[PDB]
Symmetry: D2
Subunit: 109 residues, 4 copies
C-alpha cells in the first residue's frame, strides 16, 4: 500500500524552465521543475517546485519546455532546508500533462 | 462564479471526443473519462485494478477544438473542472438528472506517453 | 492498504435533511445525507448523496441537522440503479465538519 | 479571482488560533494545521503514522472570530482554501517567501468528536 491522509493538489500554470532530468546511482530517472501559477489584472505568482520519477520523468523531459502550460496532480511534501532552519512545500507529482486550453498536442505511446 | 465544486479526474477516454456546434456556432466537445483506481489486497500482497468511475465531460470553444484534434479513444488524460448537475426530458414524462464535469483544463498524461505540444 | 488513483473531492454546502442513521446486521453504524451546494444571483444546485460509517456516522447524526453548512472531503463512487440501467455519483465520506463561516461550534471529544 | 490553486487539508491545530486586528479593524486569525498521513508497511502488514505536513493558515473577518471562539490546540479540522505565496523582510537584507493557506472554509472534523453548531 501507498499512503493515506496525504494532502493532494492540482496546479495549473507554466514551467519556469526546461525540466531538469538526472539519474540516481541506480539508473532511476528523476525530473525537477517549477510550476508558476498566476491568478487574476494578474495577481501574485505561486511557485511550486515539483519532482517526478522514472518513465514519467523521461516523458516530461522529452515533451515539455520552459513556458509550457501544464496541469499537475500530486501530493504536497515539505523539505527542511539554510537560514535558522526552514521548511519549503514541494509537490511529489502523480500525473502531469500539457494543457490543451491554448494548444494542441501530438500524443504518442 | 463562487462556491463551485471542483474535481480532478485522471483516466482514459472511452471514445474519441465528439465535437458538435451550438446554434450560436460555439464548439462543444463531449467525452467520458474512465478512472480505474488500484486496490491493495492485504491477503495476496498485490495491487489489483479497482472499479472504474465514468464521468461525462463537457468542454467549450477553442479548448473543445483543441481536444477534438489532439485526443483519441483510450488516451490517458488529466481533467480539472467543476461538477454540474443538469436535468433532461426522457419522453415518458420523467426528468433524469445527471452529474457531469464542465472542464476547465485537460491535458494528455505523460505517465505512459510523450506529447509534442503545438502552442497555437 | 486502501486504494490509489481514486477521485477525491471537497464539497461545501447544506444538508437537505437530518442525517439518517442505521446499523448493519453486525452493529456497524452508517449515516446517509445529501449535501446541496449552490454556486453564484444563485446558480443551479448540485446535490451529492453521501455515506459515512462507524463512529463518525454517530457523531454526524448527533451533531448535524437539516440546513447545516458542512465541508465534506471524500471519494466519488458510482452506484448503478431503475430506468433502462443508470448510474449515480455518490460520495464516500472521509471527513466532515460543520463550517464556521457563519456559525460557531462547541466541539467535544 | 480565477486560476487560484485550491487545497483541502485535514489535520490538527498546533495551537489555539491567534486572533489579531488590522489597521482597518478587520479580524484575522492565524494557525497551523498539522496533517499526519498514514503509511502502510508491506513488511509488517500494519499502518504507521507518516510525516506530518504543517501549513500556516490565514482567515479573515467574521470567520476569523468564529474560529478563534470555537477551535483550540489539537482540534481536528478540515480546511478548504487557496495556496498563496508571500515574501517578508527578515532584517539581514534577504526576503524569505512562504506558502500559506488563505482559508475559504474551515470546520471541526466529526471523526473523533461531536459539535454543537450555534448558527449565528
Amino acid at each position: 500500500k501507498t499512503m493515506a491522509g496525504d494532502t493532494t493538489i492540482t496546479i495549473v500554470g507554466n514551467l519556469t524552465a526546461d525540466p531538469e532530468l538526472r539519474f540516481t546511482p541506480s539508473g532511476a530517472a528523476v525530473a525537477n521543475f517549477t510550476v508558476a501559477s498566476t491568478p487574476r489584472k494578474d495577481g501574485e505568482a505561486l511557485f511550486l517546485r515539483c519532482n517526478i520519477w522514472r518513465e514519467a520523468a523521461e516523458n516530461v523531459a522529452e515533451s515539455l519546455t520552459r513556458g509550457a502550460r501544464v496541469i499537475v496532480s500530486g501530493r504536497l511534501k515539505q523539505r527542511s532546508f539554510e537560514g535558522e532552519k526552514r521548511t519549503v512545500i514541494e509537490v511529489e507529482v502523480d500525473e502531469i500533462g500539457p494543457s490543451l486550453r491554448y494548444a494542441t498536442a501530438k500524443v504518442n505511446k
